[PDB]
Design a protein around this nucleic acid. Structure first.
Ligand SMILES: [K+]
Ligand SMILES: [Mg+2]
Ligand SMILES: [Mg+2]
Ligand SMILES: [Mg+2]
Lengths: 290, 67, 159, 153
RNA sequence: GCUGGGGCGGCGCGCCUGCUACACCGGACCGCAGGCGUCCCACGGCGGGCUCAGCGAGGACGGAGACCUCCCGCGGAGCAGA
RNA sequence: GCGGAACGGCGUCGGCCGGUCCCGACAGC
RNA sequence: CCUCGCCCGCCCCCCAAACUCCGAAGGGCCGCGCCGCCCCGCCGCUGGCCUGGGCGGGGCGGGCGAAUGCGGGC
RNA sequence: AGUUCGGCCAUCCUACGGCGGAAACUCCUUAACUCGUUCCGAAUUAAGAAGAGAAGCGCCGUCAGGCCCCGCCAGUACUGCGAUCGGAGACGUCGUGGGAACACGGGGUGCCGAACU
């Protein structure tokens, strides 16, 4: 007696959404605002700094939008960090800073691969040491060569105060990239300027070290079960900023990517057969059965 | 049925005089109000291929799910 | 069975619907806050007049509240109070029976108890990115819910 | 009555197509236009800024101005016994590139290529002029014919 | 002043939507169904977050409707007045 | 061989579809 | 506990100047000769750059690429 | 083979059953810090690594609904141009050009691109 909601007429008039919208991957309003350019600038490439965060690592990409696809010109991942001196604690604040810095340095070095005079790497050398203060590469930009410019794209993430997307962006800016931004969404911000001390503390994992110390200090069972991977590799609260500084120096020294090795495996789970003659057989038997 | 078929035409001729213009009286080759000719209807009945309703009949379905 | 198929209390919603603004609403919200240790909220009629307040409780505190509330009724509830989505509820008449200390001045107030059951992995229908529907096999049917409730809070049902 | 507001008599020409509502795809923003290019005008009813008048729906013209957000299009309009050149500003959602010259461009390319090819080998140049369909030539057919007749009423 | 004579009546006497109108544009009548001479420092700008009407099922002093919960919901709601 | 309709004609000519008929029809078993 | 109704499903007769998932005949607008290669100059515009776009100059190869009729413009 | 970012936007959607995970994605665990919920760590923010294919996701199936292609419908309906053709009219016919729709039958059910593992 209950009326049917999804009728044949419901299906006839249905309009599907764009595929990436159905999967909930992209917001097409924000993308349109991001990739728009003045028509009197013709086919000049426009770059955005794309930051994504999975459950296990952090992804940084520099991509340009083309007519029929997207072009990637540089990507850094959080897997590479153990190759530089950070084996654990991936996907936290310090790791985001490190991966942003890695992406920036790698892009600049790739751009200045051949050039010898006024190469984009020699000019615009990133901040020598992480100090956590407001830095803008375009201030007093070289007249003959301007700094590489990108625009940050956050995706579906929430742009709150203290988010790691902004940490990756700050790391990328510290490598010499001109990314427009303010300092409102960083941990040191107040109604009158902001203090670099809190940003520096967060960038070096001071909060994680304090938490590890307090937990191990009194409730050690939960400490052992909750920091198993940290404890296994012998990472202690006091010897943390040293490792982060060493990783920063190593990244800023030789920031190129070595290809990893592997082989793809195709299971049988996708190997099931696609059974007209065979389909026509399963009706005659069922009809005879019935 | 065959009982009143001897006067249906006279009833139609009687009704023909109240309508403007010119009309014609015909005998259909179909079975009642259905869309089947008498031959086709009788064959499809002697082959068990008719779903029956209070007035009309329709061919059996061959699409959709089973059971 | 897979460990990911086990049921748990997801939320418990306490509702008191007595019409008209006044200390009645204020007193009822005060009692709700005292019981739940969580400030309540008001609902506006559709117009613009407050008529009711409610509060949501999650975790173990919900389990203890539900245990006391069932104690009020002697672990008896009709078998037909289970919804087609696998949820159920009941309604006491005074809050004193819950074990709360009576107040001559605060008054008395009837209550509504609605409790929502869930399985792990229901997040896919609520998150903001890659939002989807839960599979039909993962959903809780009324019979499974009745089995879990009877085996959990020692409840008998009356037809 | 008879009123002539800006959008009179647009009940059907400005509506969206069946199952094609909502926002436009992003190809309409990142394709490149140049001065002197031929474009078509098709009004999109979901975008209300930079919208041309109903008269210009389904006309072709050339670009005379490339702006920050809009294009300038020249169109020939007949008014009594005369033609006027009208210049209008259109936003990107209402304009598409036109293929009214593609056949001529391909013909020119093919003519040049064929001219180059036979010269290197010295073969005679064929005719590079389009021909309107000529009458058919002589040929021989086989007979396995079927008699055709007229049916009864 | 218009006006199937003038008068009485009405106001296609300045504007707007749909139809008449016969698939570019244009197209008459005291042709058809109607509207306007206003309202809003928010009912405006921008950013963020959210999803509406409603079916079904459940909660009960509580009912054909209050409020609460889950499910599915291509817009069946809303967006000052035609 | 009037401008002309519904509706009539066993005036004449020409058709279409069905029965009965030298095992004897029709009209005067 | 029965017997017709409201409700749910299928089937069916007949419709719309101010209904349309579909959709002609018919109309309307535009095109149907210069092209290809190389190099050079200017810009106060545009780009991370040695990027673009626009406007000019110099060399090389090729050529008049639907039908019908007929001088045009102010 | 998987993930990030895309192009065209159902042959890609919807419902219901089944198969799979090394790596990946995901589900998962905690609330000192950061930020957060008309109330709620549900969402969201931060910090993790004991569990899992039960979902989401990839693949298979259904005389599946939908969507897409071909045929038939049918030279039918309608129609441009010409006709002292028929008819009281309403309407029809001939010559010379163009030419559907519904319904029904058969089949099908995502590709393309750049970077990493
Ligand atoms: K007159
Ligand atoms: Mg946004
Ligand atoms: Mg006068
Ligand atoms: Mg006037």
């Amino acid at each position: 007696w209950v009326k049917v909601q999804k009728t044949r007429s419901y299906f006839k008039r249905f309009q599907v959404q764009f595929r990436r919208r159905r999967e909930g991957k992209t917001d097409y309003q924000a993308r349109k605002a991001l990739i728009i350019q003045d028509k009197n600038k013709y086919a000049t490439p426009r770059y955005r700094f794309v930051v994504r965060r999975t459950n296990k690592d952090i992804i940084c990409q520099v991509t340009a939008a083309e007519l029929t696809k997207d072009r990637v010109v540089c990507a850094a991942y959080s897997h590479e960090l153990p190759r530089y001196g950070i084996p654990v604690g991936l996907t936290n604040y310090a790791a985001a800073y490190a991966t942003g810095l890695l992406c920036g340095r790698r892009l600049l070095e790739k751009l200045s691969v051949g050039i010898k005079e006024n190469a984009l790497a020699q000019l615009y050398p990133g901040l020598d040491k992480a100090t956590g203060e407001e830095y803008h590469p375009d201030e007093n930009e070289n007249e003959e060569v301007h700094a590489f410019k990108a625009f940050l794209d956050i995706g579906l993430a929430r742009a709150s105060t203290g988010a790691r997307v902004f940490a990756a962006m700050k790391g990328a800016v510290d490598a010499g990239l001109n990314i427009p931004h303010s300092m409102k969404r960083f941990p040191g911000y107040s109604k009158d300027g902001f203090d670099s001390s809190a940003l520096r503390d967060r960038i070096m994992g001071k909060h994680v070290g304090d938490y590890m110390a307090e937990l191990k200090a009194e409730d050690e069972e939960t400490y052992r079960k909750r920091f198993s991977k940290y404890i296994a590799a012998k990472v202690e609260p006091l010897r943390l900023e040293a490792m982060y500084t060493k990783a920063h120096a190593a990244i800023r020294a030789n920031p190129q990517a070595v290809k990893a090795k592997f082989e793809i495996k195709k299971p049988v789970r996708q190997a099931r057969l696609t059974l007209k003659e065979r389909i026509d057989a399963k009706k005659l038997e069922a009809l005879k059965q019935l | 049925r065959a009982s009143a078929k001897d006067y249906v035409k006279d009833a139609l001729r009687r009704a023909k005089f109240k309508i403007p213009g010119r009309q014609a009286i015909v005998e259909s080759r179909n079975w009642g109000f259905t869309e089947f000719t008498k031959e086709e209807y009788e064959d499809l009945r002697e082959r068990g291929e008719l779903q029956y309703d209070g007035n009309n009949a329709h061919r059996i379905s061959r699409k959709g799910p089973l059971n | 069975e897979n460990p990911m198929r086990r049921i748990r209390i997801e939320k418990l919603v306490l509702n008191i619907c007595i019409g008209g603004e006044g200390d009645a609403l204020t007193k009822a919200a005060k009692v709700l806050q005292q019981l739940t240790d969580q400030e309540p909220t008001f609902s506006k009629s559709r117009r613009g007049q407050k008529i009711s307040t409610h509060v949501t409780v999650r975790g173990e505190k919900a389990r203890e509240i539900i245990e006391r509330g069932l104690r009020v009724k002697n672990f008896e509830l009709p078998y037909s109070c289970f919804s087609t989505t696998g949820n159920f509820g009941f309604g006491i008449t005074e809050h004193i029976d819950l074990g709360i200390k009576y107040d001559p001045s605060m008054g008395i107030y009837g209550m509504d108890f609605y409790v929502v059951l869930s399985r792990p992995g229901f997040r896919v229908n609520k998150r903001r990115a890659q939002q989807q529907h839960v599979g039909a096999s993962h959903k809780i049917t009324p019979d499974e819910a009745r089995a879990w409730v009877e085996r959990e809070f020692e409840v008998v049902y009356t037809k | 009555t008879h009123s002539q507001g800006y959008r009179c008599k647009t009940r059907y020409c400005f509506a969206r197509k069946f199952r094609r509502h909502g926002m436009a795809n992003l190809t309409t923003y990142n394709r490149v236009y140049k001065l002197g290019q031929y474009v078509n005008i098709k009004v999109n009813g979901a975008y209300h800024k930079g919208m041309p008048h109903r008269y210009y729906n389904g006309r072709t013209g050339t670009i005379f101005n490339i702006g920050p957000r809009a294009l300038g299009v020249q169109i020939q309009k007949r008014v009594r016994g005369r033609i006027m050149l009208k210049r209008i500003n259109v936003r990107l959602e209402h304009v598409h590139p036109s293929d009214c010259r593609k056949n001529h461009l391909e013909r020119v390319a093919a003519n040049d290529a064929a001219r180059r090819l036979a010269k290197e080998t010295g073969q005679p140049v064929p005719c590079l002029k389009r021909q309107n369909a000529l009458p058919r030539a002589a040929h021989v057919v086989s007979i396995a014919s079927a008699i055709d007749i007229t049916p009864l009423k």
